[PDB]
Amino acid sequence: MSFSQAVSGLNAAATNLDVIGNNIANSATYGFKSGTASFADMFAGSKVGLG
């Protein structure tokens, strides 16, 4: 669903930036450990995916 993947991918980009931001802001937090999250497409098996 093209619109759905558009909005959800925009939110995924925002999430990637926000993990970036919480990493950056905390870069002064002593001993702090940085984060990352994983991405996936609702690959229902149909062609490739749905979102």
Binding site: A40, K47, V48
Partner: protein, 50 residues
């Protein structure tokens, strides 16, 4: 007209280093095979693990 076809381009991905001992990258053909709790069998290239 109608479109009817499945195709995937299996070229190796732009390979990047990550350092973690649970990040595993594939080259050349195929996938490595996973299993689910219900005994289902599948082939994937997702290289991050725990």
């Amino acid at each position: 007209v109608k479109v009817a076809g499945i195709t995937q381009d299996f070229t190796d991905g732009t390979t990047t280093n990550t350092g973690r001992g649970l990040d595993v990258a594939i080259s050349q053909n195929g996938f490595f095979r996973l299993v689910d709790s219900n005994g289902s069998v599948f082939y994937s290239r997702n290289g991050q693990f725990k």
